[PDB]
Design a protein around this ligand. Sequence first.
Ligand SMILES: COC(=O)c1ccc(S(N)(=O)=O)cc1
Ligand SMILES: COC(=O)c1ccc(S(N)(=O)=O)cc1
Ligand SMILES: COC(=O)c1ccc(S(N)(=O)=O)cc1
Ligand SMILES: COC(=O)c1ccc(S(N)(=O)=O)cc1
Ligand SMILES: COC(=O)c1ccc(S(N)(=O)=O)cc1
Lengths: 348, 348, 348, 348, 348
Amino acid sequence: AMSLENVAFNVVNKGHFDGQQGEVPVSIINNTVYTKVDGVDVELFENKTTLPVNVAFELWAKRNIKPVPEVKILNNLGVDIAANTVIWDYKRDAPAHISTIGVCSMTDIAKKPTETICAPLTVFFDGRVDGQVDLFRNARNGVLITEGSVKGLQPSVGPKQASLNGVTLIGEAVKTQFNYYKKVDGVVQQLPETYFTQSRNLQEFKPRSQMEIDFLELAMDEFIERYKLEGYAFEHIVYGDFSHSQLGGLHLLIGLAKRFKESPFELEDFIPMDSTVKNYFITDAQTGSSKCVCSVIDLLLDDFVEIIKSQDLSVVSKVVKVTIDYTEISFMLWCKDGHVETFYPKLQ
Amino acid sequence: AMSLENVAFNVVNKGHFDGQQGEVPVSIINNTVYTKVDGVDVELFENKTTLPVNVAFELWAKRNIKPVPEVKILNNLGVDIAANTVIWDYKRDAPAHISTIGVCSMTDIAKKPTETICAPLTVFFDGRVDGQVDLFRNARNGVLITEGSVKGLQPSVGPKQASLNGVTLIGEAVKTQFNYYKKVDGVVQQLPETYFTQSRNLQEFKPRSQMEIDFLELAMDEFIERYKLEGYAFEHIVYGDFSHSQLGGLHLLIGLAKRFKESPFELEDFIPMDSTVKNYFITDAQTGSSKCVCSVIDLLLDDFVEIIKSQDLSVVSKVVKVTIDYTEISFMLWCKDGHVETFYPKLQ
Amino acid sequence: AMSLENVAFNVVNKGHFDGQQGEVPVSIINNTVYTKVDGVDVELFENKTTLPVNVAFELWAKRNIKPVPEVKILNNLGVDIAANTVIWDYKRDAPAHISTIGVCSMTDIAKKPTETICAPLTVFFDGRVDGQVDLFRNARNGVLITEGSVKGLQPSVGPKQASLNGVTLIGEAVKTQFNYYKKVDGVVQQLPETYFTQSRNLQEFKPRSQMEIDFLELAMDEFIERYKLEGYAFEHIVYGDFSHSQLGGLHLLIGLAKRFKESPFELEDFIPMDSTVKNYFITDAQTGSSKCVCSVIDLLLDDFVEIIKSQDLSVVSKVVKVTIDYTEISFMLWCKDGHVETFYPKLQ
Amino acid sequence: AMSLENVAFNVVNKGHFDGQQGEVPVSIINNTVYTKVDGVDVELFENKTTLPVNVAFELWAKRNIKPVPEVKILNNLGVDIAANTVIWDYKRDAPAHISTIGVCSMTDIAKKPTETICAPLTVFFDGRVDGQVDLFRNARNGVLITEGSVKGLQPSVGPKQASLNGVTLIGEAVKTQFNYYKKVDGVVQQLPETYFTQSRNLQEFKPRSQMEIDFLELAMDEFIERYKLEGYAFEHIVYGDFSHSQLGGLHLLIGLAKRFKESPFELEDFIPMDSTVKNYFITDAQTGSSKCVCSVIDLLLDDFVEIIKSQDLSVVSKVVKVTIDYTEISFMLWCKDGHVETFYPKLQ
Amino acid sequence: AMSLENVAFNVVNKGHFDGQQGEVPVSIINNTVYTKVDGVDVELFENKTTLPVNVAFELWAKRNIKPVPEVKILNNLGVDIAANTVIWDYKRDAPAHISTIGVCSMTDIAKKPTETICAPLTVFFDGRVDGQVDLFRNARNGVLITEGSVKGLQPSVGPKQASLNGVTLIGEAVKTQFNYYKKVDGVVQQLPETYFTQSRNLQEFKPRSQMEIDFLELAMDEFIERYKLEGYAFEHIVYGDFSHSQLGGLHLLIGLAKRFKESPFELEDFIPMDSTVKNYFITDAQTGSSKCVCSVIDLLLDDFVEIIKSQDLSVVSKVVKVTIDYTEISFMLWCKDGHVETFYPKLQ
Ligand SMILES: COC(=O)c1ccc(S(N)(=O)=O)cc1
Ligand SMILES: COC(=O)c1ccc(S(N)(=O)=O)cc1
Ligand SMILES: COC(=O)c1ccc(S(N)(=O)=O)cc1
Ligand SMILES: COC(=O)c1ccc(S(N)(=O)=O)cc1
Ligand SMILES: COC(=O)c1ccc(S(N)(=O)=O)cc1
């Protein structure tokens, strides 16, 4: 018995949809769902999606509340749809996928992922759910996560962090590092070697290596000396050049995090979505240096050093391709006289 | 288990709410309710009310589908709320009453009319429903309709016509003439002797007596002669003066009906509600004669003749009270030398 | 270069999208598209769909303006999507199909119907367009219409009438009768022998045979006698029983047409979509007889007589399957002593 | 003290804004204005404009309720704004002009037309209002209407008809024929000799000369003979060619009127504004003949005959300029061997 | 080729409008512009303006991204419109001006500021744009900013700070201090001597003089002693009196900034716009002292001291006028026995 008033009952009483029975009074005004509590209306949900308000309300209530892969990982692996769950995209306040399987009548294309309409779609399977590993084994196209080994399949070790109710974290009381498996046209793929973005914040950035601790703590000249980074243009790429009207470089999050301590700056997230490479229209408050499209990536500084130290520095400009978050990220590498000039996620 | 999807199920399968088990998928976008039928969205209801879209949808679905009093009658009798039903105002596309009793969890102020919140409210009771004559006896305030005699209760014979799903009709396969009863502060009230308006249209007006057949068919001069109406100014009051820029008189619907068969005219229904006296901004298409506030009433011409001839014609101006549709309707009577000049519903 | 302003340019200058170069200024406010004409805003389109306003505007502008099958036909044949055109559902003021193929970047699931996403979908092909007969041959699922013979393909002769810009007509200056073909899972399907509904209105109903001319003109008794219909209960089924509170029978449009010339009645089209069998909440204005779910179908009276006379009249009740508009329509047949009691489209 | 509640008071009590003291309670929800009447909300106004709901409500309430020029006339004369009144465009349900002068605090660009902001704008002046003839004399740009002679000002006799509360009529109890005057850059302009469109409808078309009575009554052959119209192609231009898939000709309203009495047809008014030449997407219900852009004009048939016979028939194609409603209307004239092939308003 | 989809292309790919060619899919739901990225809708822009959503979207995309004068300066100088740019009002999330010149078709009153409609309007000219100084020379009314001297015109030196993408800053890598020039009716004006507001924040307030450093660092008694401010009522005016139910004084931002460190308070910005004098409904959290209209100005404390020390302290109350941000700010000065009682931006 699926209904608007029962979904709202579950939200009010269980904090999300929990399969409980019961009903509460609901009123819907424009894009907002209210419920009556002692004669006054209380807001339960504001639709920020392009779906009908009652549809989005139900999908949000039925969101996965376990640690799930970040949306960028699912997108990079080509996931089209989830099996009997909703991956909620907290960066868009919207479902991560258009349709559902066995979740909501208005958005379901099927009740079970074994139905034929699901066969060409890359379905996300959660090994922590009973029988979903076996469903993946029979699936034509799909992506599977597990916490342990799967007999007969070589795993791909994913990122340490996952998303729990919109909080990206490395789990201490829960497991957030999953084994990844992917199947195309019934064939189990080898997932490529990949770096992983670290998914940290500008405001509350925490280092995850001794080099990152040293980058935040030491001065620019001292750090570049200690780790022998002369000629790699970290002054431009990581620390940022604020001397001209266009902001120079500043493509690594830890470089923004170090600057954000001393003086703040404005980042306009003009494509607000989860993606491996993020683009911002940045304005430095202290100097007035700005840049319309500033690509930023949060790589472990050790990984970024390894990437840039593993490149031929002998051509003026060329495309450098790096597998990050299971997708191919193109970089532009500019060199002169054997040293790095700039190195940025390519704007294409 | 009341729910949006169950209400929509009943509408789709039974034409209205019928207490049936079932659910269909529903999407709400702005003020409209849709349901999925074979892949595409079909409109079930457009909210024209000031209530939330899903609330109004339920009240419309639970509308009374038996012949019920016209809203102007219930208004004139001071009805505030209905006992366990919804009187739908088809002229406003909205519930006739703000609140409900045992109908909808969002608008209910009580489950049963015996709850003390209902005592100071005039509750409409339907004697055709089991136990509601008794509920009227026990109610502090109320209006009761019955199809027959209630022992000890002095009846008031209501109008011949009632409203069935927005259609105003004199019932043949159903009864539409009711006994009316009213209680104020626990005390049954004597309802006044009254005329009743005829509730006809301008498009499909039909006479209901020999005098009305005469009016529509005879010219103005021979009708006034046949029914001895000289000095009563039907030339102004009923037939209408279109010679000057301000339209003169034209306050009986039958007069508008006669003119409409010859030349059309525009009626700006600037307060579009059911009421005994209706006001329109009228523009005559043929002559350009117009009037901003032209009050119109549909009395049987026999009745109107009986009212205007009952009058003392020896004062210049006076207010004339007439009981119509159980409410007191003030007229203005202007006379000169023992003949009527004008006689119109007094604009308040 | 597809754009909102270009679509509006085509609407303003060519009456619809015509692939022309140009732009006009457009303002969007709520669900309405306006364009500036000499200083003031003029309404071009009001979105009655569940799609975004600018998306629906484009699909409406790109609607098929040739005679096309009525939506109920395409629905009965299981059509999910159209090949490189938009079938506009004028009864819903919305696209007949959720998605498009090579029409609009926001609704397109493919550019050409050969893309594998289109294979499991029944694609509508128009043989009047170059290359689409071939695209039908190569499609896994599809429905094809042609104006003439396709070599080797066994045709099904469609209805005489088609829809031209929302007008249902039998073409004289254009052809509206098509050959129909259907494919399921790569295999051409034999379309069943079928009757076709006549797609007429209650306002402007016109007979299409001597028997229908007889029905509209003769009284009930002499028509039943002339066409030997005693014991088949046209008194109930076709003419309608208005004596009781529940309206009896009245399931043929021609029967509603006869009654409408005498007294009007209200038809609540509570599922306003094109379908072979239509359901209405009907209220008879003259008598007050009414019915919540009154199924109505517009069969040529000759056909309906041929169907009801084909029936075994020796069982109390049984389901009677009739193929109409290519779909199987279940009727309920109630008999007594070798005469028909009632025969109506079975409410599901 | 201008206010929303005062404007609503005037609408409720006087049918429009009448400068009266008073207030009634108002609720605004989405684009609709409601007022409380005996416990329930009644709709006073639905905003169909691109202005805020309360702003449009005030402008509609302050609309001119005297006979005023039709919007196409004011448009053709280049009017941008009205002096101390609102010309309501009933065909757009919106103000005819973006801004106001001394009408509404939200739309006012000035309190009086003498303010210098009004100088470069063509201001409409109503000589029936005290002092506005003088304001026209002092205005840099303007259009003036009067009911009589203005000393020294050479008049232009306007059309017989005007608009009274959305009703277009030739006044009998009021005057609707005005003298027209126009000023550009402080200099009075000579208005051109012009025909006037008749502003009739397709539903209620009525002839206005013996020739038009002949057209509606006679068959095509005897009318063409009686009025010596052989070789002028009224068979195409006025009567309409419905034999081919593209509808041929049919550019005079009287021709559409004749056809409509026989078989109906659909007119898609895809630019729904008042204009001298109207464009429609037309579909003939009988034949299926259709045309995407069918320009229609309502000239008195006498005038149209006088125009087409004035023409040199010795060129293959040429643009023909005719002054109608004070604006220059380009026609296309196609001839062959001294006879007319087609003559239509040139699509721009 | 100006279009919605191309504006969105520029936003997605260049962070703002950059004249690039290309199109992306766009959907518009209520007041929000979305674009499709890999099958999911991503929000690009939420309309907070009173313009149509697609119009505001285009103007925001075309905003000036160079350091521009703060909106209060432009308003105080009477700027009506900008020449070939959009000044975006980040405090209102709306365009700073109603109309545009050569920016957007829906809002343009002209393509070039030399057109006659621009002559009476005070047009903003940016000397950093080629040929705009010369356009100012020929402009009837206008305001010009430059970074260097203009031959033949005496400059007015503006504030040190300007707005870069909504960030008010004193430019270090860009120039934010402009020369100001103004012309009324073709005559170059002398701009008056003026103080400038400092445009600082409550949260991150930074001193700009040794006296301001001392005010933040020293105690009240110590500071008033060091700078000999006895009798000027800085205890009331600048430090604030929180001992009574009405908050006393507190009209200088640096006084709020000092208090906000120790204990916070609520400021309601009930007219949220850029203005030289700001009014707040303030509630002190620590004490509960509050004031409905508390005018606040951010003057350099040295400038505020100079202003108050340059006044006659001998009358009970009088209006003190000070030129700030090129506009005349009225102050109320209250004195008793030769010392200051209060001194506040006059609430009028
Ligand atoms: C300043 O921009 C960021 O705060 C940011 C955060 C995370 C990432 S990430 N994990 O996609 O590389 C990229 C950028
Ligand atoms: C033009 O005015 C009417 O159409 C009208 C109809 C009915 C009534 S009524 N039933 O209140 O008397 C009053 C006025
Ligand atoms: C009152 O009901 C109708 O007006 C109606 C019209 C047409 C059809 S149809 N073309 O499906 O048979 C069915 C019903
Ligand atoms: C079908 O087209 C019309 O109904 C129509 C009416 C009036 C005019 S008009 N007054 O501009 O000449 C033009 C066209
Ligand atoms: C508490 O109020 C403020 O934060 C504030 C900031 C700036 C200005 S200012 N530059 O207009 O004078 C005025 C007030």
